Design a protein around this ligand. Structure first.
Ligand code: G6P
Ligand code: G6P
Lengths: 365, 365
């Protein structure tokens, strides 16, 4: 059952300390800093010989690709392209024999993702499935893959599977760079982060009541702009998607560096704005975005890290999440957005697990 | 002056038959199907030897890249990556010696685009400027370039420069494939399209009164979803941007193949929806998107081609544009969206040339 929770989605959000452990179970060894994804053991040397990584997906799975693009670029040193599967197909995207294509899919049955897989296979690319469903078409038809091991997810709006996909792609990245002397300190930083992550997720979930109060402030609103950049760009997209999915409010993710190029004309004292600002190398530029938003009379809610003394000092509405390594922080920063969507949906009387007009998996067309 | 027009933006929209001719002037010869961009004459063989095209830009210039990605892929057979300049920089995107990087910029001074240029130059990439401003930093600092020759554009919301950038990148694509026997019929198709385009733009502008009537139907609305896919994905993004820029309504471009993955939960009888449906190879899939929207009680306005008998027959609100070749159709289909933004802004009492919170060029940070 959902037993102890009124919805599957809330259960699944609160399961994230355990789902992240489950994803890393048998794969990461924190004593000797090894990571092994057995499903990729054979094919790994081959992947390192490939020239480009292409991540192909729909919906929240696509966001997990956007969330891990930078660390994949960093640690593989390969170009990484992230593609919405329907557009990838419409464009007859060039794929080559020495491309490695990843198919990210909770269900493993999404029609566009599966047809993208078949397209790449026809062109001789090495294909890799990252799914949550053993025995699924995408799991069966790829050359190799990783079962993210998040466990069954029933909520139509995906929560634990997003963060389990995120962790899976980070573990892949860690395997890819494991022969480089120069990257050993970076790998150890990230792995110590992964070790700490479950406890930090518990700490985020403890602010559920604060998020519920923010949802009471927002639930009459018709729009909200969610702004972030760099590692947190995916966080804003996925948070915007979540609020669309189950609340039906018109939430839009805005790349923070593009704010000044159009979206800022929507900012005034009446447009709700959520800004994500983390202490990574984009920090000063995000502070600049915040300053612009405030200068145009917006009253943003800011998601920042607990140790970010200056924005806590100088900003009235902050949702304070624990600090982690730059490339893992989005796992923490998305959770208040998952919870915000949840609580907004509840305030509005809407079904959180089975929203209108949506399906857990779109297997047709 | 703007003389005969009350705004620079309306003047600039109505100048598009002439700006497109100006862009192609001295470059396309319709008698012998040659295209020559002298600024690229020397460097062309070198570009053909490169391995990847990367288009880097902000705002509407970025949309022109999205609008031409597919035809560039098709005719160059090269991978093409399109990047928002601010994100490109934040990620420390891998660039290589045998990449060719294009910088699309009306002003040639946008800080993020210019810093992207400098980043690529440092990495030994061949750099190409596509700008509307002679003597600009991006024009001066690239290895070669094309002045799009649209003439001065004063409206902060870019209109003629979008369609002139679009045409410039198509002419580049035509140069790239000009030694291939197998592509000669395709090149001639596209060039006969470019020859016809100015007259077809006049025909679109003649429906200004119909668009003004649609703006009267929309101007109390707070949101609008603009949906398209394939070649028309850029058209929906740029139309959404235009409505944000000068009307301050919350318009969002939605990739039509992603509709079913979240945005469809926003559709009911009260959410305005504009769908773009063209008779290219995405047609049946767009009809499916339309059917879903109508099935969930939406009442969309559809932008379709005049000769699309079946959606004209079966859909009540259509904005009927002239038929062109698939890879040029977005030049026509964006124009009613430029005009819709214009007329909405006028109905709301807002300054169309100098909207709040925005600048013609963001040269700082
Ligand atoms: O992640 P996949 O099974 O390929 O599905 C892609 C998407 O399809 C459906 O729309 C779901 O409601 C989503 O939660 C999901 O992100
Ligand atoms: O096209 P560029 O000069 O690089 O400018 C990028 C953008 O900057 C400004 O925001 C303008 O208002 C836009 O119309 C434009 O698209």
């Amino acid at each position: 059952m959902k037993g102890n929770f009124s919805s599957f989605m809330q259960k699944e959000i609160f399961e994230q300390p355990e789902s992240v452990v489950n994803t890393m179970r048998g794969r990461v060894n924190f004593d000797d800093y090894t990571v092994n994804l057995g499903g990729l053991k054979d094919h790994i040397k081959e992947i390192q010989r490939c020239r480009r990584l292409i991540l192909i997906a729909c919906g929240t799975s696509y966001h997990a690709g956007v969330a891990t693009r930078q660390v994949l670029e960093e640690l593989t040193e390969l170009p990484v392209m992230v593609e919405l599967a329907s557009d990838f197909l419409d464009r007859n995207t060039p794929v080559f024999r020495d491309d490695v294509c990843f198919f990210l899919s909770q269900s493993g049955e999404t029609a566009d993702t599966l047809m993208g897989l078949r397209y790449c296979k026809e062109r001789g690319a090495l294909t890799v499935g990252i799914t949550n469903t053993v025995g699924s078409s995408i799991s069966r038809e790829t050359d190799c893959g990783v079962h993210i091991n998040a466990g069954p997810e029933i909520g139509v709006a995906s929560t634990k599977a997003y963060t389990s996909q995120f962790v899976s792609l980070v573990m892949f990245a860690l395997m890819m760079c494991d022969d480089r002397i120069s990257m050993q300190e970076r790998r150890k930083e990230i792995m110590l982060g992964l070790k700490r992550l479950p406890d930090l997720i518990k700490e985020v979930l403890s602010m559920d009541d604060e998020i519920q109060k923010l949802a009471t402030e927002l639930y009459h609103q018709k729009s909200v702009l969610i702004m972030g950049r760099g590692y947190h760009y995916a966080t804003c997209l996925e948070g915007a998607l979540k609020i669309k999915e189950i609340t039906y409010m018109h939430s839009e993710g805005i790349l923070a560096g593009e704010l000044k190029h159009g979206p800022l004309a929507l900012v005034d004292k009446l447009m709700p704005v959520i800004m994500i600002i983390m202490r990574d190398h984009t920090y000063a530029k995000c502070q600049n975005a915040l300053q612009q938003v405030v200068a145009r009379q917006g009253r943003p809610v800011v998601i920042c890290d607990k140790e970010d003394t200056e924005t806590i000092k100088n900003t009235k509405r902050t949702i304070k999440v624990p600090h982690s390594v730059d490339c893992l922080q989005g796992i923490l920063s998305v959770i208040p957005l998952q919870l915000l969507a949840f609580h907004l949906a509840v305030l509005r009387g809407y079904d959180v697990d089975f929203p209108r007009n949506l399906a857990k998996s779109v297997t047709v067309e």
